[PDB]
Amino acid sequence: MREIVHIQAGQCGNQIGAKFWEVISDEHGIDPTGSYHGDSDLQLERINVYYNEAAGNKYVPRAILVDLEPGTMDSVRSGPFGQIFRPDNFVFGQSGAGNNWAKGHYTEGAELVDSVLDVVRKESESCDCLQGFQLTHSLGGGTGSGMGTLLISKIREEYPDRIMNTFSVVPSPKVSDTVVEPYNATLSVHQLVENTDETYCIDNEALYDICFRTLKLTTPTYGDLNHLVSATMSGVTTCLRFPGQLNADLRKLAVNMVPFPRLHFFMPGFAPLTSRGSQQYRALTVPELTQQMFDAKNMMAACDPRHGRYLTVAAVFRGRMSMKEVDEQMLNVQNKNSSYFVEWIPNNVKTAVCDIPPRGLKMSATFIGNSTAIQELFKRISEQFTAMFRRKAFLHWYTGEGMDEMEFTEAESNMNDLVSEYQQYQDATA
Amino acid sequence: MRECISIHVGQAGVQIGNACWELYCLEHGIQPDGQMPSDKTIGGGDDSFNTFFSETGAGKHVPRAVFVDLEPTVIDEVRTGTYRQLFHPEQLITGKEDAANNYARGHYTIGKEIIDLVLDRIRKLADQCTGLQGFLVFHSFGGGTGSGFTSLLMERLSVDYGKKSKLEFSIYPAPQVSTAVVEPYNSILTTHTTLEHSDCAFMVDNEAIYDICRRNLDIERPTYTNLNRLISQIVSSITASLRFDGALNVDLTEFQTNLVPYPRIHFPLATYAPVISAEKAYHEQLSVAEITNACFEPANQMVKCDPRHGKYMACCLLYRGDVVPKDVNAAIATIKTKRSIQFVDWCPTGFKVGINYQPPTVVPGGDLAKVQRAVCMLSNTTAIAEAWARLDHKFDLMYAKRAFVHWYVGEGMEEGEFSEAREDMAALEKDYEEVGVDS
Amino acid sequence: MEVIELNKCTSGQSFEVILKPPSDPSLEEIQKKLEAAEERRKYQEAELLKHLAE
Amino acid sequence: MYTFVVRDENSSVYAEVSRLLLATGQWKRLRKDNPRFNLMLGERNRLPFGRLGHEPGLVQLVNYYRGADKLCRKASLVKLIKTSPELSESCTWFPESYVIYPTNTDEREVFLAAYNRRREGREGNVWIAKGILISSEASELLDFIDEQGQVHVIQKYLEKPLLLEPGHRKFDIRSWVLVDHLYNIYLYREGVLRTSSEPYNSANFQDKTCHLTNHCIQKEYNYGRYEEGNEMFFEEFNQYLMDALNTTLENSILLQIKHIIRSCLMCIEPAISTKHLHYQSFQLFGFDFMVDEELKVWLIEVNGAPACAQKLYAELCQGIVDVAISSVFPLADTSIFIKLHHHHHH
């Protein structure tokens, strides 16, 4: 009734994208066949935000699956919720993008993009009132990063008055040794600053450190990293999918979260942090959730929030608990750390409560923060980029696909401009 | 008998309208289906309640009401709820997508594509009216629709109904239940734009109401339903003289005369007592003196502010229940000696009193206890400017950095509309200070 | 002190007690305002599409 | 962790209170426009009382009582005493006084009414203006008033002051009064006499290093002769009243002082009390008294932002913290004040 079209791109995009559909499909009681078997009408009231209905009261994700190689899409197709996705919404090439932004954005990806738009268009046309698009992808490879940003540009051309949202996985050398990731990610960030409204920065640095240091997993796998992504995605989309007042559509979230059009990069956090499988036996009290969701160690972006100031925050508490105690605790964090919240945006913290908890938990909290400390993320990428770029290293892979050095220089500059704007507001004062 | 049309705009306006017409129906013994056993002129008449209801040959009483929202969820609840039959489908107008908490989107962008339709549905009510006096408009200051579309609508009713009166019921934004950080921006924008078009406006600060609910109804965390039931009693109290026989405030014109000598200063403070929880086992019934005296407690006001530090230009007391003038006069005598009540020099120090013998009606299973006697004081006091001050300060903080402004520019509004709206409020706070303070 | 304008009826009564005496836009101009805002949105949108085209 | 903000840099007293609060390590100071404070120490002008008590989750307290200015401007004080029946024109501890404006309300004519029954009794007829001049001659003040610009006060001058010996000196008494959030009225046990240093010259009024007892106007013209800084404290002045007059401070003066303080503040309690309000106030006042040769006490003025005297800062500021603030915001884990209460039954 206010529909969202979801797109997932590349290996990473499709991996987390699949996990997201598994998790939410279960929260809304949909099963692999696409049949509702839940026991609550809360589950269905806003089901049309993410699912189309079908013959036999069937629910079908409004989800387009994109990759330049077939590999992962056969892994999607024959995973648990593989059957649920609409088969003509699988759009795949044959060659792959070889971790190369330029191929995904300018050569190999441009061949495929028209067919993805045809599928987007067919999905946009059956929509009573389309709100926008959410894209899942990594920024360190070639398809999700290069082709993903190409798509975004093209969708905004056809739907310039719809909201664009991404969950963008930021690369880290603690997780990948592919040497051109900083290039691919600086080029993507350039696109993102210009053409999205909200971006969830999901930093592989942070997910790895959480797995290792806090969940005591000595050999984290992508499965462990993605469990954290899917929990966060479940949490940050709760207000869109369940009945509610605050940030209940993409536009309203954006208005609440983005004071300046370029500063739309969000830090998500989650409490309690869990590892897959192992159960959690104690429920958290509302104070523990509050203290934890705001903890640096619970952030999915590896930035220290005490190094910045929060422009805006949204908090979402899930489960059966006292709204009185939540308001009190929410108020106590701000009044006890008020200097970390910009005083020139009054009442910048907003709080929602959904009665349905996530599977496996009695109580949970998701935090979405637009903080100036995210600049640490962009500096880090920028340092890694510069170390290579100043010797023009690895550039032949990009110039061989038509690109000029100028395009790298513009991108580095735009990301350095972004970083300094965060700084500007960090320092501001009334 | 002259008719009145109620326009309810955006979620807050609609939900509060819902609450008011439920109460109006219980007060005049009108049932959910619209039938009124006590009404003996079947198919028409010019009784006092007909100011708010029109009649059909089938014996059916229907609100002189129009609900408008730019999204449909909330007006759908009206369409399928207990009072579904009361209203005609043409009175309930909805859009597809809402103003997203943005005045500009509600004024300029979505306003355009729906204003003409709404004016037309209003005109269909005004043509069942032998002698329309004007409109009561209900909205939030902070919503996109509530602020942006209402101000556009107000501009248009001035044009298509120039000689008609317009009263507002306006919800002033409170962080404890607000849904947008831009509520200050919208609130100033819509105030600037609506000020010349409004004759008398009754503000209700959600903060005041929310606390009255915690403090006096023992509600751990008030919902809109709690808030709105309380608000609807105040409104009902205010409108009672239009819907019942009496000689005070019998028409919209009289509200302006009795409450608003200086036109821009048209924001009377409402104070209400007593508010008593229905769960309270033992309640000692409050006297006339006691509830009158409670009218000068800030804790009972619709807006928290301190009238001791301003001046009055007018004051009405509206009593419901077992009350006689003798008691009111004695209560006012003791209260004058005990309290700080300074009128402006160019006004008589007095009170206009209205007694309606029927005690307040409460919604069954509501949170409010039935009481023998209640009162609602309406006072035009410069103390209310404190609410303007608060809202302006917050606007200043944000606008100094241009935070969020791009969202408004992006809908076609010019930045300079911000400073112009803010200049108009600066002058407003100036007018309240000239009137209210000396040295 | 001094009660006045006492009015009584079956439903209630009213009176005044006095303790102390004293001592606009046209339909046109609107359609315009809305139309200028809309042009401003069309220009903003055209500049973006111009940019996407480059 | 309680929090607070400071909006008057120039306040001797609240400078000290900041320091004392910080030093508990349970108070954190904020930047002056951060709205999320328990406590404001406010500016002297256009303090935004209208923005207080609307931050949820915070009990809020301010160090001024909105409305107390009516006590503390000479114009308003004079007005308050005549007009308030609890005080009245009968009032015997305030000097006969009159509000007068330039000609650029007024009660000039009514001033004359009394001026020409002292010139028709040939007795004392010295008056004082409010930049400040004493004269026997009406028009030398009236023409002095219009020629200055502001609204002023004319007040019977006290021709027969009590004089200290050695010195034949003049003085005023300054008492510090703290009113807390419950409207407890606390009189600080230490007060101070602000002495003249130069024998009280009766028949000449220009040489004003003897007629005015202001700490600043003594300095900048025998300063330090009989006592440090022209400040006699109470042990001393009591002792001197014992020796020289056979009485005590308590009996001859302090009862009148307590009485005068109570009456002034009870008078305005209904207009300024914060008892039922959404924010809470307290305030330190300085009351200024004259004493005549008969040991009759007269109220001169009330100061809404008084400064303390050097020796006493420490003890007073500690006591402000103890009773005004930590009563509202308790810490974990010898009373310098005398509480003014009195319920006589009639």
Ligand SMILES: CN[C@H](C(=O)N[C@H](C(=O)N(C)[C@H](/C=C(/C)C(=O)O)C(C)C)C(C)(C)C)C(C)(C)c1ccccc1
């Ligand atoms: C050699 N690089 C290591 C690596 O790629 N390790 C791989 C690794 O740990 N991988 C690929 C995990 C992923 C999965 C699915 C898994 O099943 O292990 C991590 C990165 C999440 C692997 C498979 C070569 C052992 C890495 C962890 C990035 C590393 C970086 C800095 C310092 C030390 C180790």
Ligand SMILES: Nc1nc2c(ncn2[C@@H]2O[C@H](COP(=O)(O)OP(=O)(O)OP(=O)(O)O)[C@@H](O)[C@H]2O)c(=O)[nH]1
């Ligand atoms: N008292 C009260 N306040 C409400 C209610 N609903 C919303 N509000 C308040 O009104 C403001 C939000 O405005 P809404 O009326 O929701 O906005 P709208 O008019 O629907 O505007 P859009 O959704 O932006 O199109 C906030 O201050 C809310 O607390 C209600 O039922 N009662």
Ligand SMILES: Nc1ncnc2c1ncn2[C@@H]1O[C@H](COP(=O)(O)OP(=O)(O)CP(=O)(O)O)[C@@H](O)[C@H]1O
């Ligand atoms: N009626 C009167 N009779 C005798 N002396 C008087 C008087 N009125 C004022 N004085 C003297 O003049 C001095 C200064 O007057 P006043 O105290 O009113 O001015 P001020 O407010 O600038 C100083 P402060 O604020 O500390 O009291 C007094 O301390 C007193 O010595």
Ligand SMILES: Nc1nc2c(ncn2[C@@H]2O[C@H](COP(=O)(O)OP(=O)(O)O)[C@@H](O)[C@H]2O)c(=O)[nH]1
């Ligand atoms: N968190 C997470 N990161 C991934 C996953 N798969 C790949 N990555 C990261 O994504 C980047 C590689 O992009 P990939 O999606 O594999 O390239 P593409 O398929 O061409 O888009 C590197 O930063 C990898 O560490 C995953 O499943 N989860």
Ligand SMILES: [Ca+2]
């Ligand atoms: Ca090819």
Ligand SMILES: [Ca+2]
């Ligand atoms: Ca094609």
Ligand SMILES: [Ca+2]
């Ligand atoms: Ca009838």
Ligand SMILES: [Mg+2]
């Ligand atoms: Mg791959």
Ligand SMILES: [Mg+2]
């Ligand atoms: Mg709405």
